[PDB]
From a paper:
Within this class of proteins, the bromodomain and extraterminal domain (BET) family contains four members that are transcriptional coregulators and that recognize acetyllysines (AcKs) using a tandem pair of highly homologous bromodomains (BDs). Using the highly conserved BET BDs as a model system, we conducted three mRNA display-based RaPID (random nonstandard peptides integrated discovery) screens using a single library (which contains >1012 unique members). Crystal structures of 13 distinct peptide–bromodomain complexes revealed highly diverse structures and binding modes among the cyclic peptide ligands.
Sequence analysis revealed the most abundant peptide, 4.2A (making up 21% of all sequencing reads and a member of the largest family isolated from this selection), to be related to 3.2B. Affinities of 4.2A for the three BD1 domains were at least as high as that for BRD4-BD2; in fact, BRD3-BD1 bound 10-fold tighter (KD 3.2 nM), a finding reflected in the presence of related sequences in all three of our selections. SEC-MALLS for this complex indicated a 1:1 stoichiometry, although a complex with BRD4-BD2 showed a weak 2:1 complex in solution. The peptide interacts with both BD molecules through the insertion of an AcK residue into the binding pocket, and the geometry of both AcKs closely resembles that observed for the related 3.2B (featuring a bridging water molecule that mediates the interaction with Asn140). Remarkably, 4.2A presents a very similar surface to both BDs in the complex: The peptide sequence harbors two interdigitated Trp-φ-X2-AcK-X2-Leu-φ motifs (φ, hydrophobic amino acid) that are directed to opposite sides of the helix to engage the two BDs. This interaction surface—along with an additional hydrophobic contact residue observed in one of the 4.2A interactions—is also conserved in 3.2B. The fact that 4.2A and 3.2B belong to the same family of sequences, a family also found to be abundant in the BRD3-BD1 selection, indicates that this helical Trp-φ-X2-AcK-X2-Leu-φ motif is a highly favored BET BD-binding unit. Similarly, 4.2A bound BRD3-BD1 30- and 40-fold tighter than BRD4-BD1 and BRD2-BD1, respectively.
Author numbering:
A (entry chain E): 1 to 14
B (entry chain C): 56 to 164
C (entry chain A): 59 to 166
Write the structure that this text describes.
């Protein structure tokens, strides 16, 4: 829900 | 409505809490880190960034003057997503669902 | 092949590590934490640069080909799991092209 984990998830969404 | 602290408490305790638990809320819970996510023109297109994490801490710390100012931040968050992305994108389908739920719950103020 | 492995660590891996596209590949994909229930079903051999780094640092590779194979597994995993035109595939393709430019200069 934050930091790398959120960013990774966010990246994979695109 | 004069007691604007009460409507803001409702936005935090009922509206935001309900949206936070939605399965599609997570992309909007942190600011968009455009460099790390390689979105090179994001801050050029989006001039007023907004996210639910920022709205939450603003509600918790008595930032807003009234409920409409908070509602304005929600609408900015949704429109930013619609402007920067293309129609039919996965993240846009998620934003549309949150906005529909959001507008559904603010009717009950 | 002490010399080739030293090059894979200090030149090849370090160059990719410093690129701004390195961060999605610097630790294993934790499919539970990332809410990716299908990841381990599709990707049977997970691999990342953080794992490659520890294997080089701890002399777990016997030759350069073993290390190069792990790099290729990492890239293919990304291509298999994601779609062409995904943001992460653009990053992986650039990192792989960069990787191949440094593998050309591998010592003998």
């Amino acid at each position: 829900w934050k930091n790398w984990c959120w960013l990774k998830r966010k990246l994979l969404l695109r | 409505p004069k007691r604007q602290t009460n409507q803001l408490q409702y936005l935090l305790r009922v509206v935001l809490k309900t949206l936070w638990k939605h399965q599609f809320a997570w992309p909007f819970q942190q600011p968009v880190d455009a460099v790390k996510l390689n979105l090179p023109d994001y801050y050029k297109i989006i001039k007023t960034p907004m996210d639910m994490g920022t709205i939450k801490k603003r509600l918790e710390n008595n930032y807003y003057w009234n409920a409409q100012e908070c509602i304005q931040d929600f609408n900015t968050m949704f429109t930013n997503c619609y402007i920067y992305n293309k129609p039919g994108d996965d993240i846009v389908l998620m934003a549309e669902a949150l906005e529909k739920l959001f507008l559904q719950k603010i009717n009950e103020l």
